[PDB]
Amino acid sequence: VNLKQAILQAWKERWSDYQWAINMKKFFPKGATWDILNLADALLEQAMIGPSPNPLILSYLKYAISSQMVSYSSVLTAISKFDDFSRDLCVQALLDIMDMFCDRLSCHGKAEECIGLCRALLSALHWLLRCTAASAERLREGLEAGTPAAGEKQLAMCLQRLEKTLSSTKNRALLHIAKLEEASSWTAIEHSLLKLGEILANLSNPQLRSQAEQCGTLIRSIPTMAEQMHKTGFPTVHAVILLEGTMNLTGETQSLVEQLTMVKRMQHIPTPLFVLEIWKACFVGLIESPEGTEELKWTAFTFLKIPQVLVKLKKYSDFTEDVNCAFEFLLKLTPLLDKADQRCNCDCTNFLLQECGKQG
Amino acid sequence: METQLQSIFEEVVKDEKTKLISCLGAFRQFWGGLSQESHEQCIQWIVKFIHGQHSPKRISFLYDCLAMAVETGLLPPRLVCESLINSDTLEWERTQLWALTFKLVRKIIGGVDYKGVRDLLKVILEKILTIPNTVSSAVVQQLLAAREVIAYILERNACLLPAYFAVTEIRKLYPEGKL
Amino acid sequence: WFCNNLIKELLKETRKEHTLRAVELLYSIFCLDMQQVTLVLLGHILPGLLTDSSKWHSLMDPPGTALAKLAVWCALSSYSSHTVNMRDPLNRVLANLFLLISSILGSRTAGPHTQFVQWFMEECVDCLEQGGRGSVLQFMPFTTVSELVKVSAMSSPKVVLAITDLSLPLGRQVAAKAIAAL
Amino acid sequence: IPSVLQGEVARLDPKFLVNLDPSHCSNNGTVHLICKLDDKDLPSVPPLELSVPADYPAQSPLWIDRQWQYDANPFLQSVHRCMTSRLLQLPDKHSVTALLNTWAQSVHQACL
Amino acid sequence: SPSLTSETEWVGYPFRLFDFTACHQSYSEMSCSYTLALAHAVWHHSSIGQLSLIPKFLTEVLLPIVKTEFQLLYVYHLVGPFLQRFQQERTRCMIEIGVAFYDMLLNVDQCSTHLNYMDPICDFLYHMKYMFTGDSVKEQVEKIICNLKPALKLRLRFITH
Numbered sequence A: 001v002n003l004k005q006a007i008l009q010a011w012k013e014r015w016s017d018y019q020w021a022i023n024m025k026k027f028f029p030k031g032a033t034w035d036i037l038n039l040a041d042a043l044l045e046q047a048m049i050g051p052s053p054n055p056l057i058l059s060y061l062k063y064a065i066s067s068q069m070v071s072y073s074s075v076l077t078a079i080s081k082f083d084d085f086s087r088d089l090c091v092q093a094l095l096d097i098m099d100m101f102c103d104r105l106s107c108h109g110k111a112e113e114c115i116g117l118c119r120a121l122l123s124a125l126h127w128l129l130r131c132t133a134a135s136a137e138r139l140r141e142g143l144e145a146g147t148p149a150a151g152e153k154q155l156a157m158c159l160q161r162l163e164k165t166l167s168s169t170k171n172r173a174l175l176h177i178a179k180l181e182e183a184s185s186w187t188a189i190e191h192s193l194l195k196l197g198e199i200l201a202n203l204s205n206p207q208l209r210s211q212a213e214q215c216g217t218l219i220r221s222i223p224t225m226a227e228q229m230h231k232t233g234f235p236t237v238h239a240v241i242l243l244e245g246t247m248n249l250t251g252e253t254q255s256l257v258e259q260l261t262m263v264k265r266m267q268h269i270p271t272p273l274f275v276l277e278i279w280k281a282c283f284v285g286l287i288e289s290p291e292g293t294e295e296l297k298w299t300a301f302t303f304l305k306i307p308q309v310l311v312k313l314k315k316y317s318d319f320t321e322d323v324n325c326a327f328e329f330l331l332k333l334t335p336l337l338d339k340a341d342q343r344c345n346c347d348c349t350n351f352l353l354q355e356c357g358k359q360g
Numbered sequence B: 001m002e003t004q005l006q007s008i009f010e011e012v013v014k015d016e017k018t019k020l021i022s023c024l025g026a027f028r029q030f031w032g033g034l035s036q037e038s039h040e041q042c043i044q045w046i047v048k049f050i051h052g053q054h055s056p057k058r059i060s061f062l063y064d065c066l067a068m069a070v071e072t073g074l075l076p077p078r079l080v081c082e083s084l085i086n087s088d089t090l091e092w093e094r095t096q097l098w099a100l101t102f103k104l105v106r107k108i109i110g111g112v113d114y115k116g117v118r119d120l121l122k123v124i125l126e127k128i129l130t131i132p133n134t135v136s137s138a139v140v141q142q143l144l145a146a147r148e149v150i151a152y153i154l155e156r157n158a159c160l161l162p163a164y165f166a167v168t169e170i171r172k173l174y175p176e177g178k179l
Numbered sequence C: 001w002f003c004n005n006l007i008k009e010l011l012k013e014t015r016k017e018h019t020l021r022a023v024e025l026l027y028s029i030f031c032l033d034m035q036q037v038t039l040v041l042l043g044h045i046l047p048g049l050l051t052d053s054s055k056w057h058s059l060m061d062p063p064g065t066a067l068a069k070l071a072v073w074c075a076l077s078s079y080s081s082h083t084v085n086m087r088d089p090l091n092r093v094l095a096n097l098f099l100l101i102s103s104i105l106g107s108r109t110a111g112p113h114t115q116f117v118q119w120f121m122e123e124c125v126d127c128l129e130q131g132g133r134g135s136v137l138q139f140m141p142f143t144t145v146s147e148l149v150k151v152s153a154m155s156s157p158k159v160v161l162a163i164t165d166l167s168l169p170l171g172r173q174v175a176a177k178a179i180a181a182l
Numbered sequence D: 001i002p003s004v005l006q007g008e009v010a011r012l013d014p015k016f017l018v019n020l021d022p023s024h025c026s027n028n029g030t031v032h033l034i035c036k037l038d039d040k041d042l043p044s045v046p047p048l049e050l051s052v053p054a055d056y057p058a059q060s061p062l063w064i065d066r067q068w069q070y071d072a073n074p075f076l077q078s079v080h081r082c083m084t085s086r087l088l089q090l091p092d093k094h095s096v097t098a099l100l101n102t103w104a105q106s107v108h109q110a111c112l
Numbered sequence E: 001s002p003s004l005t006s007e008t009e010w011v012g013y014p015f016r017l018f019d020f021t022a023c024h025q026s027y028s029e030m031s032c033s034y035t036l037a038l039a040h041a042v043w044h045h046s047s048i049g050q051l052s053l054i055p056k057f058l059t060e061v062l063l064p065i066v067k068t069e070f071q072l073l074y075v076y077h078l079v080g081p082f083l084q085r086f087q088q089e090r091t092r093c094m095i096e097i098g099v100a101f102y103d104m105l106l107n108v109d110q111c112s113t114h115l116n117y118m119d120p121i122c123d124f125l126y127h128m129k130y131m132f133t134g135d136s137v138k139e140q141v142e143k144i145i146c147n148l149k150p151a152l153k154l155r156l157r158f159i160t161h
Helices: A002-009 A017-027 A038-048 A055-066 A074-080 A090-102 A114-144 A153-159 A172-200 A206-219 A235-246 A253-267 A271-287 A295-315 A319-331 A334-344 A348-358 B002-013 B016-032 B039-052 B056-071 B077-084 B095-108 B114-130 B139-143 B145-154 B163-173 C002-010 C016-029 C034-050 C055-059 C061-080 C089-105 C112-126 C146-151 C159-163 C169-179 D005-010 D074-089 D096-111 E031-045 E053-060 E069-089 E091-109 E118-133 E138-146 E150-159
Strands: D018-020 D032-035 D048-051
Touching: A002 A017, A002 A038, A017 A055, A017 D074, A038 A055, A038 A074, A038 A090, A055 A090, A055 D074, A074 A090, A074 A114, A090 A114, A090 A153, A114 A153, A114 A172, A114 C169, A153 A206, A172 A206, A172 C159, A172 C169, A235 A253, A235 A271, A235 A295, A235 C016, A253 A271, A253 A295, A253 C061, A271 A295, A271 A319, A271 A334, A271 A348, A295 A319, A295 A348, A319 A348, A334 A348, B002 B016, B002 B039, B016 B056, B016 D074, B039 B056, B039 B077, B056 B077, B056 B095, B056 D074, B077 B095, B077 B114, B095 B139, B095 B145, B114 B145, B114 B163, B139 B145, B163 E118, C002 C016, C002 C034, C002 C061, C016 C061, C034 C055, C034 C061, C034 C089, C034 C112, C055 C061, C055 C112, C061 C089, C061 C112, C089 C112, C089 C146, C112 C159, C146 C159, C146 C169, C159 C169, D005 D096, D048 D096, D074 D096, E031 E069, E053 E069, E053 E091, E069 E091, E069 E118, E091 E118, E091 E138, E118 E150, E138 E150
Parallel strands: none
Antiparallel strands: D018 D032, D032 D048
């Protein structure tokens, strides 16, 4: 209304960006407060009305965005409430709007509406995917009728996302922190994505399909939450098993399974090396053992108990292939295995192999 | 020599990039007329004046001009970097000179010969040594610009210098048994 | 006495490989009475090191990252084994540890203590699992220094909600105001 | 808070409403500032983020340059040109009042 | 041998298992480590003339065999610590062994897909250059560096230029 009427006072009074600012300051006094919903809304539809967005009215919006004037959030919500029924280039105009803004989302200030900001970013992601779907339908009906010209241009708009902060606990983690109150919106990211499953694989554009699958995996990287060339070997698992053999043999399998999972997680031990170290520690404790009544302890440990631990570990995770790789590592240690054969008086790995095979 | 150089100084004391291209035009004439052997004291006095200005913005745009002077090949990289990180004015106390200096060395160090990278790494490590083991919570982030130049020299994907030279200098300045 | 005279040995090693091997082994030499070892290590030794101004020189980078890893591993293993009942000693000592983390992060002086505390935070983020949901036992007046680990970030975003007490009403606001900066 | 900056902030002109940055901890030696122009005559522009070298006075308060602020539009880029030039001219002893006054003159001269 | 030619995926970090000082105090030795151990004592106690057989042994009967990366690392671990002995008495065998080392790197590059441990290899080569050989192997190594994969040339650039 009256606030809308000022935009009319600039309908074709191409006053300017700056004189627009000063006019707004005069007309609606900023004494108490503003930007509740005023500027973004009052500007949007009076710009996008009809086929082409009014270049000057859109220009003042570009301005108010650039000068940190409106919200950085109410703008997102205003674009979110846009209803792609405009099959024309106007969507490209709103993309040009999002251009300079989306890469940097300060929202610093009162900052309580920052949860509002992630709410808005979620609604804007919904709007982005909806525009993607409309532009893909245009792609399809154009493959029927007209060669595409600007259909995939909103893919670069999604590439405006996919940066950390754009999808970090700004978007992702606060996406779920927001579904705590807007679970319907988590179902919304799932739901738009369901129809995305329909409208994705049909397209015949290879590079664009690959980028779209990348964005779709980064959406599937909303569950998001190193050191591949682990060189030095893993000595803590060695010492953990060795301690569980020396001090506390009768301790329940569950306790040792708990301790061993923890260490694997904390230190990111590849599962082939885990079992290698367990079996190496058992043998070393057996070889360097007292003569008479402690040797039975190491052998009972090595041959009966560690197998049940590895069974419980299999339960707590291709583990067969994994223990196979571990045993392949182990067999390629002739000194330790031959000392074991010497001390135990029998082939200490033939037996261990048959015993490990007897379990799962 | 000294007179026209002092005159350029009074000018830079007396559209910003346009003023800077004017200063580069002023530099190019003196350089085309500068001797080939007195380059070193020339740059020494240049940077000496650069560090005199106590204004972060003034040293900022003077450093930007120096970056153009070294980027457009008018100025040799080795001499300018050695002079920058070889001065008596460069002290960790004046945090702004430090931050801007090492942000400049980061940019212009790409391109020094490998011998010069050795010498520069030696002198930069010697410079970080002067920094004590307790600094104000504010300076830390700016002081850490030295970590940037050290990291760029060391990173093997940059291959600025023979890695073995880097380890040789680092070990000479940090023998076995000293953190 | 045990934890003190073993960490004093860890802190004298100058080479990276040896300090890492040292902490890997100390974690298992410590599994003997892991709970009490955690209590004493965290409570009496890490504050003693972080509040001396002369033990600060020992927390330098080759031995300090190792001690940080060991502390995070100890904290996770003591909690993961068998509102939150602040009568449990482990909970009280964890609360005190993170309070000191806060005071050190937001203090006028910066030095190796700040780097060690940042390293402890980084490691607690790295090996963060489902057990220690809220950066395990970040106290309620905490998450107020998530802002400080942002201002002194030296660390990627999205690790801070991993820090942050997610799935909470006030958690929403704190995490949002936080990531707004980084 | 250095309590000299407190004075200069107290005695300013009303149009230059200045608060301290929510980001950072102003506690340590230098307090950051987030000052946002007002004044009915002017055109609202982007805020100017200040930083005071607590050794100040005799220490110029830094400015934080960013095209992320001004790139879009002509009025903003003109503002930036005028601002950087006039600030470069400002002599060697800047006080926060000098920065903010210069900024006001820059906005005004860009309104031309 | 299977331990280094084909079944290289099962021996772990090469620089680890090719040490027998460690990898023994923890019973993780292999036969290759033993042989490299007895080949450092035999060569430590040998005279200069007896080691003069090492340069020939490197080219006539070792250069054709070595193809994989671990084989190259093994040959380096053997003949490396004795450049210090070759240099002081017999200055030519050092030149021959350097020419052999670079040639072996060419072979290992011209037969494998990715030289996984490029950094330690290039490190040892630069160490050789700067400490023992100096500027007396340029002509023979120029041709060899010219024909390496671009990643290796990028690092070994400073050897000659």
